[model samples]
Each structure stands twice: as C-alpha cells, then as structure tokens.
Target chain A: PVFIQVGALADGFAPEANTLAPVDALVGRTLALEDASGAWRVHTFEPGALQWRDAATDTGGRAPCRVTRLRDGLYFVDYIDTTARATSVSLVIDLDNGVWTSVVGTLPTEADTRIDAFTRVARGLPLTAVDAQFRHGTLGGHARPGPLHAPTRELIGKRTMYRYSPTECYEHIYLNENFYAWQCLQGVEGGLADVDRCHYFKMADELYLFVWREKVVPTLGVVLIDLAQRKTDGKIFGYQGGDFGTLSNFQIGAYAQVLNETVHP
Target chain B: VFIQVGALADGFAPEANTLAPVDALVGRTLALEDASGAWRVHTFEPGALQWRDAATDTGGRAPCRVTRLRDGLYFVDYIDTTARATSVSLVIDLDNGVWTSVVGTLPTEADTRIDAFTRVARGLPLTAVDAQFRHGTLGGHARPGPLHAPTRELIGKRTMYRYSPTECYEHIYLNENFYAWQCLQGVEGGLADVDRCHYFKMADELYLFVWREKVVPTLGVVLIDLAQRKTDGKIFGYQGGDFGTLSNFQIGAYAQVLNETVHP
Candidate 1:
C-alpha cells in the first residue's frame, strides 16, 4: 500500500522545512497516531508550541513539542519520546487524507517494543523493535479538541426543524442511535422523507457535530449545530455522474428551532 | 497509482458490508434517457433486468441487479453477457425525470506495471464512460424543474463524511477532473487515494458526486444536501466473501465543511 515511515528520509538530507506556517487547530486536541505495531495517542493541550500528552493509553507520557504544516490538514511534528530521551519521534499527520507516517529514532540500539513493553506492563501483551525503522498506519480518528464532543443520547427521541433558506426547511427526528428519519417540509426535496444511518457527537453544551448518511442517494452530510446560537453549519459531498470525476461539495447553514421531545421509558 | 485495497493477509477486513438488493422494481419498466442515448429498462424479476437502447437496436441484454437509494431513484448495474469485459451502471432520478448512465470497459488481454508505487496496468488499457446528466427523453411532458446539471462549486474544498461512528471519510475536491479521498475512520480505515471523480449540481447548495478508485476497483456514488446538512448515497463493491457477488449497498453520512480554498 506504499505505507510511508514518517521518520525515514526525515534526516541526513538538507530539505526546506516549514513550507507552511504552524497551525492552531491542533491545540487542545487528542490524536491517536496509529502505526504498524501500536498506536500513539497524543493530546495537544498547549497553546502555541505543540506541548502535548500522548495519553489515549496507559503507557503514555507528556512532553513539550514543535509543529509545522506540510500541507492542508497535515502537520509535521517532532519531539523526544514522551517516555524516553534515547528515542525521538517524528511524524507527519495527514488529517485530510487519513493516513499517517512516522519515524522512530532510537540511540540505544533502537529498543524493541517486544521487550521494552513486555516487562513494563506484562499483561501478557505485545511489543515493537527499532534501529531507525520506518513505519506507517491509518489515523485512528480526527485530531479534534476536547473536552471534545462525544456521541450522546441527548438528541434521542427529540425532533428539530431547521430552516435552511427562505424557500427551504426540513425536520429531523433523532429516532435512535443507528438511524434517524428526515423529511423536507419545504424546498426542492420537499417530498423527500426516509430513514438512514446517523452519528451524533456533542461538540459542546447544546451544540453538536451531527452527521447522517442517506440510503436513497449516495450522500453524506457533516453538520455542526449550536443550539445556543440557534444556527447550524456544514457541507454535503458526492458526485452525480457515471465516473468519479465530478464533485458536488456545497455549503449548508440552517436556523434551528426545536419542535418536540418524547421521553420513552 | 497504488491500488489502495488492502491485501488479505496483512490488510484489514471491511467492518460494514452491503446488504442484499430489494425487489421493489420487479415488473417495472423505466424509460430512461441520458446525454448518450435512450435506454429502456425492463425488470422482469427481482434478480433480472433487461435494458436496451430504444433509438438503436443494440444495448445490454444480460443478468442484472438493482439498488434503490432514494425515492424514485434506482441504481442498477450489470455485466454484459454480449461483451465479457464490459459493465454498465445506470443511476436514474425518476421522480425528477433526470437520469445518468455509466459504462466501464475492463482489460483482459495482458497487463503490466511500471513502478512499485503505480497501480495502473502500463499495457492493459482500462476505459470508462463520460456520461452526462440529462432529463426525461421518453415523457418530457411532465417532470420537475431545475434538472441536474454540472457544477464546479466543490472545487478546492475540504469536507468530511461521518457515515457512521465506525465509518468516516474526508473528501478533498481538488479540481474538476479529479478529487481525493481517505477514510478518516470507518469501513476502510486509513485508506486514501486520488482518483477520477465527477460532480453535478442538484439544486442550490445541493450536489451529487461520484468517484472511481483504481486501487480497490470501486465505484462510489453519493448525494449531499447542504441546506439540511444531511447526505445519502451507496457504496458499490464486491463482497469480500465472494468476489463473484457484486454487493451494491446503502450508505449515507452527516457532513462538515472543514476548509474551502478559493482561487480568484
């Protein structure tokens, strides 16, 4: 799969660095940087410099770090291993593409995780070995900040109507966890009413990152709602063609107004 | 050009899968028309669909299957019995009287690759249809207004699709001819690729997008409505169990616009 090791090719050659300025989006966020052998979940709890806590797990540590942008939605960061000074970790986090590249550098014979982790937390579990070995893997999730929004049941059994435009409006009945029903009360899709898969992430108190994927059409919508502000913002993505060359990425904002809530025992 | 489909041994298996097709279109005939030509789709059984070009005597006559995504919309696909290496996929918006058809021709002769990173068969040629979005040619007498048309609104934009907590993807609409995507987390986690893509304007702030992946050999078709911040679509692929079975299943997602790069 052309898996890339972020640390490999990271040194030795003099290359132009910091092509793009450091980004602020990563501040106060926890990221799980998954690799071939294990996962490095880091929490960027600092402001300007990328001081972070690699804490999505128990065998984790915190340390000060440096950051820079290599591409949109992608960040390049380097720091001493949270738990060790003999090893340094360099990574390129491509949030936009969902892939991650990492290079783990070790001075003490690139200690293997097999022995290092086995004796550390011998739950009869696993390990890694290194000598400047290059590795790559998938991003576990979005590098979104927390006290982050998590999936909730608050919107369950509740109905809300959002007026998208002067000529558009729709109703959302959060039926349950896996599915929600929607119908266009007015607008181009006025007669559209059906149930499909849904995901709810609480972004804040009375605010959410509500997403839905439709079955009838190949459509996916990522919506962010602010109940306190009575507004919603998001985008819809898909193509309407024979081949995959067309793109229909559009913006959607709505005025929120709740209709009713049902408490089911 | 690495075909991103994971390998059986080291690769991860897909968590979600396409379900069986419904027989809602049995005994129904869709008189369809696209920019290329007119097609008469006849569904005789739940598993059988016979489609032929009306203007011309030649079309596809073979075993067929269908996946109905939205209301009045039927996306049917089948392999050509007449031509072994040819496949046809048609997506029709019957309720609005608009339709689009896709036909892809595969290579069977000989194949080769140039580099370890490239997936394209240097010698074997793969062909695809450039079908356009059009409206009713059979009964244009009555249909909805504002038919599906081509649009460039998505270019230079970054969007996310939360299909499920388990399935999420980010789409970067790079330009008109192509778009790039990756699984943020979901069915095919960490999978990413740049491939051929297309887009159509469904309405103001509403769009229909599709992509063909050379790596996994997949065709993804979807629709996104910004006004409601909701989406619906389907993932078309072969079942991991048996490559013989084409599992065209339902998929939809909630969306968020992360970034938009504007060029003036």
Candidate 2:
C-alpha cells in the first residue's frame, strides 16, 4: 500500500509544494493533479471516503500542468504558460467517457525551462515519452533540448558512466550494451540539487529510474538500473514534500503493474 | 499535472472525500486475515507523511491479495481452510519476513477463477478467468472465457516464448513491427468482452483501439501505416457501451511533434 496524497495550491502561490506532479492511471484508479482556483484540479483519495475530491476541472489553463496517463481511461493535460513564456495548452481527458478534448498547440522552444517533466516508457515498445529540459548554465549544466537529439546518433560518444551529485549531471550510458540513460543536471541552490525531471521504466531487467526535484524542498528520486547486474539502486529521498516542488507546477505521472507471482525469474 | 491531495489518516475516523486505494503495493505491506481474526499491516515510511498501521502477521489462511513478486518477495493469497474442506487457494511466501509455502496445492476449480497474476517476460504468468456453467429451464448462465490450462512448469521459467490463447491483451510494438493481440470476443451475460484496448503512435501512424461488448459496445479505431503496412482510417460505431470488463474500456493519444507534446 503506497498511497500518498497532499494538497494546497494557493496561499501565496510560491508554496508549489516542491512539485510532485505525475501520477495518472486508470485500472483501479490513480490520478492526481492540483491547482485549486485558477483551474487545474483533479485529485483522488477515498478509501471509503477518507476525503479528497475534485476529480476533474481544467478551466482551460493555469498551473504549469502536464498530466499523462495514456492507456486505461486516457489523460494528457499539458498546460504550460510560464506567464506567457509563450503559451502552451493541451487537454484530452476522457476519464472513461467524460470527454474533454482540447489541444491547440505552438509551444516548444528548447534551451531548457520546461520543468514539469512528464514520463512514460516501456523499453520493448508501446510506451515511450520522456521529457526533461533544464539548462541554466554553470557547473557543466547540460540536458536542454537534447531528448536523444533525433533518436540516435548512436548517442554520440556517450561516456561518463555515472555522476549524480546535487546535479553535477552526467550519466550518459550508451555503452555496456546500451539500455538507455540520460540524467544531465542543473537545478541547483544548495539543498542538494539535480533532478529537474526524469522518467524511465523497464522493470523485468530493472531500469526504473524516476527523478523529479522541484527546488528547495519537494523531492522524489529513485534510480534502479541493473541492466543485468550493472547495478545502481538509489534514493535521494524518493518523494519528499510540502506538496511537491515548483509551487505546484505538477507533472509526474506514473503507472507500473506486475503485482504478484512470488518472484521467479 | 494531476496532483490531488486531501488527507486525514491519523486515528482513521472522519472519512473524507473518498477514492484512495491506488497504492499497488510499492514499498510493501499486506497483512490480511481480518474476518475478525485480527492481523493488520499497512505501513509506509520512506518519506512518511502519514499512513500507518501495526500488528503484522503470517499465520496463514485469510489474506486475499498481496502481490509484489519482485525484490523482497510477496505473493500471499491465503484461505486454505484446513487444506481440503474445499476453499483452498494458497500461494504464500513473504520472504525476508518469513511465511513460506510456495505453491503447495493451487489448481483451484469449480469453473476456474484466479482473477489476476502477471509477469510477462521472465515467467510466472498465472492468469485465470475461465467459466462455464449453464443450467436451463429458465435460469443460470455464466460463460466468461479464455486463460487457464497451461502450467507445464508454470511459465517454463524463461526461454523467450509467446503463446496466445487470447488474453495476452497487450504487448505492443509499432514502427519496429510486433503487435501481439488477444481478447477473444464475448458479450452475452456481460464482463470479459474486450472493453478496451488502446495503442497509439504518430510519426508513423498506427492507432488501434477496441472497446466492445455489443448492444452498446462499439469504439473501434484502427489506423495502421508503419510506413505503409496498410489501413489508414477506420473508426467504428463510436461511443456506445455495455462495457463488460477490460476495465470499462479507455484510450489515450496526443501529438504535436516539432512543437513537442508527443504521447505515442
């Protein structure tokens, strides 16, 4: 039982609660997203009425949104307007037939600044959508528009096996039989940085990797790697928060299933 | 963009908005036994914001769900009832915390009904749902089909295989080919009818949705083109549903390419 819920979207606005945005799934229900008033709500928590409603409410745009959850009950809400850093709106909720569809477009600049990193990966195919863009400079920052550039220059000279410290960034992986790895750093300010956004999955051979840091407090970091014993296993606190980073920018959807059998191979 | 929150789980009483139960067992906690026989267990302490419970147990028979299967082991299911007075279904194993009994007698019957159990590539499948009971003169039916009968080594432990009697239900692959399928068709009394089956992809086209059940089950999309393999647009009867299983059917897709939004 790993159920967790925390809210609050307006009390000054800066309390973005560090940022814990991605969590959407619909099989037994699991969809989270909050931004109270200005619009960008969607919460869940009702262990027989323990409370937490507002299932859907997207008045168009407001609250650095980015919800993903593309399979059972669909969901894709993306709303990034960083004060007109050049609008970016999207919404496609269908929480099982409530229908919402509204996706206009025109928002992709590059040079880093899209922190609500969304993720969906399957590895053998069927789920692939990873996002992360944070390039402010200094300390070797990296990882700005580079989402694998154009699908494979063969990862172009990948080296730097691992280097995750507050965000010194650099965890390239393309060698040792390649399974895919990126982790470029930059989101510093003490409080040990480096986790602007990350999302990867593979499971059977291990790969997991889910990182999301929202500044000052909001935390969530969990690496796992082991592409057949290459080994990694991590945890920067894998989920800490005032409600999770960026004041409440939100965008960290996840879904992983394989409940039981009792482990064998 | 889906952040939701509003708790009150301290002594557990007030009961607020309602919906929580999405925790598919992440860090571990599955005690099971409560028919009054007592035996709790539901802790959560990694960043611990709340959600606690004590008194764990292992004395067997009563659990009902507790599936982890990876890492620190966990696969309970209990309910033996003295082995044969008929309610058997064991599967235990909590390792690292004890509680053995690996697979000691679990081929249940009475028309099949194991419910759920997954593990695709590395073996340990275990998925049951079979059904078949009739009884005429004016009542009783229950057909439910597919998935059961295949335990020769219980998944063979691994050897790269791909068998399908329907019910693989999902295992996609677009530009690179692969596209496994299985949902066998149904809809007479309800349930098990391919209620949902999505799978999208854009740069090379390739959509595929199916939400069926007849009488109202329609929602068929198709759009293939992995560089021209055929088909391009098909749409079905559109929204209608008596949605039987497959969890009420659902689908999702998004595309914005160069402007980056992709959800292929």
Candidate 3:
C-alpha cells in the first residue's frame, strides 16, 4: 500500500524585506555617448551633481529620483516622468539609439527627433542644419541663443534646450540643475506594477530605465511606458508613485532657471 | 581551368530511353477484410489487382490500367453511411502523432479531418463493452447485404473453388476497375503543413478487412481508394488513379476478404 502526504507547510521561511542600498559601481565612471554619426562623447557622472544643498533635502543624497541596474551585462536605467520637463528627458533617451545611428549613417535629416524647433529659427537655418550645428558642439559647452522679443525668446529657449542636451547630463565644478535635474529624473525608479521603492542601480556599465507604469496606467503598462525588469521573486517591491513624487517635487526648484534658456537671438 | 565531360555515343554512354528497375522501396501495400468485427484477412499488391485475367484459367498480369498511386489511403470499409450489404477492409498504418497532437490541442473546435477521424475511430472502445459491441473490427474480409441477395450468391459461387480447411476463408477477389475511388487529398507527414503523403512505412503491420455489404444499390458508384505517400525525393506515388494497376491493389482486395473470415 502507498500513502501520499496531502498538504503541509515546508521549512525555509521567506526572507524579510530589507532596505535596498545603492551600489557604487557607476561612481566616477564615464558613460560614452554615441551621436547620430556614430561619433562617441564621454560623460562623467559628477558626484557633486547629485549632492543636495536645499533645506528640503531629506536623505541628504540626491533625493532619490530614478534608479536602474545591470543584469547580464546590460544597462537598465529608469526615468520618472514627474513633470512635462521630465517627460522631455524621457523622450530623449527613447530616441537616442536611432538618433545615434542617424548621426553615423547620414547627416541629420529633417525628421531628426532630437533637436528643438526654435534652434532652427535662431540660426536662420533648417532643423537639419541646426541639428548639425549641435552635433559639432559635442566637445564644447552647448551653444546658447542671444535674448530677443518675448515670443522669440521663448521659442529660442525651447529650441536651444531641445536641440542640445534635451536629455540632462551632469558636469563637474557646477551644479547644472537643467541637466542634472533631468538626469536625476532618468534615475527615478518606480511607478506602478510592483514599484514599492525608488532607487537606481548601475551595473554592466549601462543604465537601464525601470518604472512601474502599472499604477499610472494599466496592467503590464510598465512595458508600454518603458521596459522594467520585474523582480524574479514576483514581489511588487519597487518605488511607489507617491515615493517617486517625493523625488520629483524636490528637484523642481534646482532646475528652475532651465526654463529661461532659449534658442533665439 | 576546368574540363567538362558528357556521354556521347555507344558502349558506356548514358542511355536516355532505358527503363528503370521497379523501386521496391516505393510501392503501396494493401490489406483487406470482410466483417466489421473480424481480424484482417488478406494483403494485395496494387500491381496484381490491375492485371486482367487472360482467360478463366490464366490470372491476368498485364499492365493495362491507370497505375499511379492516389493521394489518400485506400479504404473499402464500412462507415456510418446508410447501411448496405457491403464488406469492410482498410490498409492503414499509424498516423503522425505530432501533427495530430497539435491539431487536437487547437483552441477552436472544428470538424475533424478524415485522417483525424480514422485515428479517433481506431482509438475508441476503451472499455470491454465498447470493444465487444460498439468497437468495430480492425481490417479484414467482408460480405455485402442480405445473405439471399444475387450479388452475395455470386460472391459465394466465386468462393466455391477453394478447398475446405480447419478455419473458414474466402478467395473471391476483383480487379481495381471494379470499384470507384476517392480520398481526402492533402499532405500528411507528421506536422500540419501543406504537403502530401500518408507517412506510412513499408513492412509496417497494417489492418485489412474482408466482409460483406447487402443490396449495394446499382447506378451508384462503389468507391475504394488508398492514401497517398509523398516521397521526400519529390516522387508522388499512390493507388488507383495515376499508375496503371499495381500489385498492392490485388493484395488489398484479397486482404479484405481474408479479414472478413477472421472476425465475422
């Protein structure tokens, strides 16, 4: 006669939840940027860009904006679209691969998604020509448009920002909020699906963006908004929407001057 | 630099019009029976079935019929169609499992194909009651309709030539031209893609039947056709329609009669 055990709880209790610590793997590392022409530009993540000086700083570290990780030698960077400005930064990375390929394959075409419209007016050139102008500035500080009439100034500011570094990057010696704030948004890590925490991890020398769009959208909406690596343990323990706003609302003040930069003369 | 050679004349030159030897590897094997409940009784060669008996004494062996193999399994078996005094016999091997499983697992329910139908029929009768009554015989010999019918009597006369033995058997057979044939034409290897072939291997055990059908109406066609076997090497071989009669046809007719005796 054979006897079979029906149901019983086994040993091995689940691991207790622990606070995730940021890995220092990406500190001081150079992230190479490939332009549409396949030209490479190296950007260093300046730790100062991540430092907080305002009274609103809670953790003292760059108020947790976005987080990413490396798995199997690939970068995973997440971008939090807290505001319209943050959404613009998200668009930059989304179009980066194609833009880089276009740079290498051909000169900028009219369809280039990287540059702003006002830059075309500032230089009295077409969008393609303006795009080329910015491409040439890969090694130097980005070009800025001279002040003009209010409308023209607004257009110039939008175009200049859109054309050069539409996506933010951090530099040493100065706290460039326009770029760093956007960069911090790219590092913002949580939204819907299983977003319980908001932290970024840098591994495999690439930054992968992860966001739980489920809370903001629908089921599996995270994949639609942007791809996120679901934790293997099936726990929805990434950054929650409210926690992400903490990072976003705080970063808005630093980059406040970014709105003034224009592309018009 | 390269040199090319072609056979030009006489001696060892390649002959364009020479006849090729019969390929034993690529021929159909037919099995037949009589009763729906009996073991298969006989096996025939399509080649022999097409042979015209020269006289009442000399069995016909000439190739005077359309001899190419058809594209479906040849079956002269009993089905659910209005019952007649007809014998049942079939020459079939195993079906392609992978293809069947894939189709079986399809989410949508659809009408079953003939091949699928045959497989289900063979797999039925899982219980003893089902086997004894509900389950039909495999392949074998058969007789047609009421025992007192003229055709059935004719079939008896045809069987009188054979001597009695411990077990009863019948020897009556017919040429391929005796029946009309049709098949569900399509490719059948093991997977569900558009191709042709029944995927049966030669020398593999198959069933046959030799049974009877009562009052098979006249002016209506009696059909028996074989499944086709598409060769991997681009050769389409089958029974009835294409090739002038083949040996397997004779074996099929004989097997059906033999099948009827074993089970009926």
All candidates in order of lDDT, best leading: 1, 2, 3
Candidate 1 vs 2: which has more lDDT: 1
TM-score of each: 0.42, 0.19, 0.19
When sorted by DockQ, best at the front, the candidate numbers are 1, 2, 3
Candidate 1 stretches with Cα past 4 Å from truth are A1-265, B1-27, B34-37, B44-48, B55-74, B77-82, B85-87, B106-136, B139-147, B228-230, B236-249
**What CAPRI class is candidate 1?**
incorrect
The worst-scoring run of ten residues by lDDT in candidate 1 chain B lies at B112-121
Among these predicted structures, which one has the highest DockQ?
Answer: 1
lDDT string for model 1 (A1-265, tens) is 1111112212211133212344567777766666546665554546554444443445665665556543346565655564753455555555665655554544322122213221222233211122343445566764542232246877875667877766667777665565566655655555334444566765446756566654223345556566777776654443332133343434456778876664422
Provide backbone clash counts, one per model. Answer: 55, 33, 147
Q: Per-residue lDDT of B1-264 in model 3, one digit per residue for the tens?
A: 000011001111222211122222134322222233222222234322321112222222322112112222222222111122111222232221000000001010111111211222344211110001111222322332221111221111112111111111222222111111111111111100101111112222221112211011001111122122111011101112122211111111211221111100
lDDT of 2 by residue, B24-122 (tens): 444645442322332334333332212212343333324233333233323222233344311111122232222222122212232112111111111
Error of 1 at B20 (Å): 9.9
Query: Any idea how many clashes model 1 has?
Result: 55
Question: Which lDDT value does model 2 have at B116?
Answer: 14
- How far is A262's C-alpha from truth in model 2 (Å)? 25
lDDT of 1 by residue, B26-79 (tens): 886777654565655444476877766667656655666665545555666666
**What range of 10 consecutive residues in model 2 chain A has the weakest lDDT sum?**
A119-128
